[PDB]
UniProtKB/Swiss-Prot annotation:
May be required for DNA interstrand cross-link repair. Also required for checkpoint mediated cell cycle arrest in early prophase in response to mitotic spindle poisons. Possesses beta-lactamase activity, catalyzing the hydrolysis of penicillin G and nitrocefin. Exhibits no activity towards other beta-lactam antibiotic classes including cephalosporins (cefotaxime) and carbapenems (imipenem). Expressed in brain, heart, kidney, liver, pancreas, placenta and skeletal muscle. The gene is DCLRE1A. Belongs to the DNA repair metallo-beta-lactamase (DRMBL) family. This is DNA cross-link repair 1A protein. It is found in: Nucleus. Binds constitutively to TP53BP1. Binds CDC27, which is itself a component of the anaphase promoting complex (APC). Binds PIAS1. The chain holds residues 700 to 1040 of 1040 of the full protein. Induction: During mitosis. The mRNA encoding this protein contains an internal ribosome entry site (IRES) in its 5'-UTR. This 5'-UTR generally suppresses translation while specifically promoting expression during mitosis, when cap-dependent translation may be impaired. The lineage of its organism: Eukaryota, Metazoa, Chordata, Craniata, Vertebrata.
């Protein structure tokens, strides 16, 4: 059965609730983004209305074969009416097509569901600037002060310089990048761009990328692996065995692999600065874990919330243990007392 934090009170609406069967009283299902924990349950047999971004709608149609008649894509930053309720989708600064949803309830309550987000000061000049928000359903993934990581910009800088240096020293090195979902496409795109290569990948991943409306994409990606020196592979294959095996398949074109695993936060963020990051090496294979996050750091989340000043917060992540729930509630209270709302 559908949990309470996936329901929008006073509406016919749910958010990211497709794994529960038919939800009692649900007249429209919103989907914030195409990540599997959120889309779980959707397919070609789904016959209710789904509301989402254009990009998300492209993936529903082409990857899960949902029928066109039930996909309702909405423009960003635009007041829209859905079953008699005013809504707005806003960019979530998560993966491609990821939104936050503003709901304007009949009774005057205003609710913001962030879906999955990376809070940014640029959100303080969206349509959020104009009015008060009563409830905030918040992506609390890294809601604890030990969660620090660098900006996305600093991480790409590190990666571009690393890859550029290695291939310039050895023109027979291959660069490999791990993936398991949409998101983080800048990692592999920026590296291909500095090396003047296209990024090569399987047919299923190429398809997924063709749904994302990225400008001049046909110029960056390809399924011909032989013509590319930046390869994408599934994240699980980014280990010494998986990579040695892959190198075999390249038939003596390359004699070295430099690979990257984009993670979220790892505990080595507590001690090491981005400039100081070093790989794990075995033979002619090196692997860098790089902390490219698409979720708010603690400080980025705090800033957004203390700006917003919601009357009530409902977490959507880490909600399963009393210890986590308790911890999050203590931080909300601090933030509230510190800012004075
Ligand atoms: Ni996500």
């Amino acid at each position: 059965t559908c949990p309470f934090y996936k329901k929008i009170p006073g509406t016919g609406f749910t958010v990211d609730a497709f794994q529960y069967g038919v939800v009692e009283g649900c007249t429209a299902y919103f989907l914030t983004h195409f990540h599997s924990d959120h889309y779980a349950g959707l397919s070609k047999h789904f016959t209710f209305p789904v509301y989402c971004s254009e990009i998300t709608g492209n993936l529903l149609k082409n990857k899960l074969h949902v029928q066109e008649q039930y996909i309702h894509p909405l423009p960003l930053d635009t007041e829209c009416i859905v079953n008699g309720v005013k809504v707005v989708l806003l960019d979530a600064n998560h993966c491609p097509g990821a939104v936050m949803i503003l709901f304007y309830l009949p009774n005057g309550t205003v609710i913001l569901h962030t879906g999955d987000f990376r809070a940014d000061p640029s959100m303080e000049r969206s349509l959020l600037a104009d009015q008060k928000v009563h409830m905030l359903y918040l992506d609390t993934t890294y809601c604890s002060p030990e969660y620090t990581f660098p900006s996305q910009q600093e991480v790409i800088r590190f990666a571009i310089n690393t890859a550029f240096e290695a291939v310039t020293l050895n023109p027979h090195a291959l660069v490999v990048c791990g993936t398991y979902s949409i998101g983080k496409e800048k990692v592999f795109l920026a590296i291909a761009d500095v090396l003047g290569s296209k990024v090569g990948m399987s047919q299923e991943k190429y398809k997924t990328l063709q749904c994302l409306n990225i400008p001049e994409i046909n110029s960056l990606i390809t399924t011909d692996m032989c013509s590319s020196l930046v390869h994408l592979l599934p994240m699980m294959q980014i280990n010494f065995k998986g990579l040695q095996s892959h190198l075999k398949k390249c038939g003596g074109k390359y004699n070295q692999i430099l690979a990257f695993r984009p993670t979220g936060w790892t505990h080595s963020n507590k001690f090491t600065r981005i400039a100081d990051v070093i790989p794990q090496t075995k033979g002619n294979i090196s692997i860098y874990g790089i902390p490219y996050s698409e979720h708010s750091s603690y400080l980025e989340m705090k800033r957004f919330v203390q700006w917003l000043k919601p009357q009530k917060i409902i977490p959507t992540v880490n909600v399963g243990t009393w210890k986590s729930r308790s911890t999050m509630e203590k931080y909300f209270r601090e933030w509230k007392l510190e800012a004075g709302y």
